[PDB]
């Protein structure tokens with residue numbers, strides 16, 4: 001959760017037809033600023049897309065016209081937009097308009113002090129219910145940093161090679177085993193086994209619980225549940241199915257390498273435990289810019305006639321991973 005952070009203004013270029021504004025690079029993000037607002041190297045607060053920013057006309061008067069209603073409280077939800085022909089993602093405001101935060105500097109997460117929350121679409125009914133407890137603390141949650149935020153890491157990972165997978169749009173799902181206990185979790189909570197719960201019901205049609213206890217290992221099968229009712233069903237599936245993308249070694253406190261995972265996925269299907277994996281593409285030796293990685297995000301999804309949300313890259317040592325979301329996808333499904 002780094003929705004509002006203090007960053008450094010990168011390269012600033014003009015925009016033809018209107019010099020009231022200019023285009024300012026913030027790490028891998030691009031963002032339209034008023035002319036005379038930033039100089040290259042200055043510091044400001046960058047608000048990522050999906051930020052929900054409560055209405056304030058001294059601090060956020062440029063969000064005035066897109067103020068909406070969200071959970072009774074009320075402000076502007078930042079999302080991908082084309083302003084005067086220029087693709088613009090996020091918000092970049094200088095430190096002068098935040099007098100209470102001169103004390104901070106680059107890297108500081110100022111989300112909480114600015115009251116920033118995250119907009120989230122209506123999460124469908126069959127994915128939250130009887131909660132047994134918290135997401136196990138001995139299991140890592142399933143978040144992928146955007147490539148736009150890893151500009152130095154991308155260049156220092158030159159030479160490294162990655163497993164490239166399709167980013168399916170559903171919800172994150174974790175089925176795991178610790179000793180005698182097999183469990184089923186959503187994003188932030190372990191759930192109880194009930195009658196129509198999508199996660200638990202998904203985990204039994206593929207018998208992945210009996211596959212985990214068969215492997216006799218403390219592992220965490222983490223994948224994406226997509227299908228009917230879930231996020232518009234972009235792939236046009238029938239029903240709901242689980243598509244694995246990561247396997248967490250509970251005891252070693254690390255993820256399996258993609259080779260370790262691909263060996264475990266086959267071991268499962270060789271023994272009649274039929275699990276699906278997120279679509280696999282050719283592995284990639286990193287050598288590209290952020291903009292050239294993002295240029296690979298668009299393309300066919302699981303349904304090869306629909307355009308995918310993006311891609312996710314996992315270093316073949318299982319230690320470093322990131323996402324790359326199609327910007328065409330974000331413009332098309334503006335409810336995301």
Ligand SMILES: Nc1ncnc2c1ncn2[C@@H]1O[C@H](COP(=O)(O)OP(=O)(O)OP(=O)(O)O)[C@@H](O)[C@H]1O
Nearest residue numbers: 142143144165166167168171172224245278312323
């Ligand atoms: N092949 C894949 N590899 C890794 N993660 C994937 C894959 N396909 C889908 N995902 C999902 O993408 C999520 C990480 O991407 P992202 O940072 O966009 O998550 P988020 O913004 O927290 O939630 P959401 O993706 O629902 O908006 C994971 O929680 C995972 O469930």
Ligand SMILES: [Mn+2]
Nearest residue numbers: 143144145146
């Ligand atoms: Mn995320």
Ligand SMILES: [Mn+2]
Nearest residue numbers: 168169170171
């Ligand atoms: Mn998603």
Ligand SMILES: [Mn+2]
Nearest residue numbers: 049050325336
């Ligand atoms: Mn998201």
